[PDB]
């Protein structure tokens, strides 16, 4: 079985990476310019865009890529590091509102994960949780278009 989402870790933190179109993407605030481990040694990033808070390495072993969304839906679904699916209503180019706010703890460790559309295709990459007193009611995400463009 191959996975589209990788649960990754650095010495300091744990987060997620998502394979889209042959590339393993994640948030620059989690990886930085770090290289990714492989059994033949570390492999350097293929893309790095601090502005978009995006980095990309060649897709790793045991993974499969996600297909970018093309339906244009606003009913998104966030997948957490625990495999939980959270419905999100898209509010704009890079933001959506949780249909049911969750305590921030529920979304921790998930940056880099995918925002999926009704067809399970990639809409964007979860960037950051937008909190209000410890409760995550919305999220910021990097549109797949930015990834497509970076490539």
């Amino acid at each position: 079985v191959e996975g589209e989402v990788q649960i990754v870790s650095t010495a300091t933190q744990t987060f997620l990476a998502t394979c889209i179109n042959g590339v393993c993407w994640t948030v620059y605030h989690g990886a930085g310019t770090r290289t990714i481990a492989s059994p033949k040694g570390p492999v350097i990033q293929m893309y790095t865009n601090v502005d978009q808070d995006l980095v990309g390495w060649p897709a790793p072993q045991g993974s499969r890529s996600l297909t970018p969304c093309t339906c244009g839906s606003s009913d998104l679904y966030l997948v957490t590091r625990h495999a939980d699916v959270i419905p999100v209503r898209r509010r704009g180019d890079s933001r959506g509102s949780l249909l049911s706010p969750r305590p921030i703890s529920y979304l921790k460790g998930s940056s880099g994960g995918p925002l999926l559309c009704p067809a399970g295709h990639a809409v964007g990459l979860f960037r950051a949780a937008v909190c209000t007193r410890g409760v995550a009611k919305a999220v910021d995400f990097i549109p797949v278009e930015n990834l497509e463009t970076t490539m």
Binding site: V1, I7, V8, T35, I36, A37, L66
Partner: peptide, 16 residues
């Protein structure tokens, strides 16, 4: 340092 893969998630729930 290096980013290591600690686990994986299959979106379809495929057991195989």
């Amino acid at each position: 340092g290096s980013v290591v893969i600690v686990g994986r998630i299959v979106l379809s729930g495929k057991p195989a």
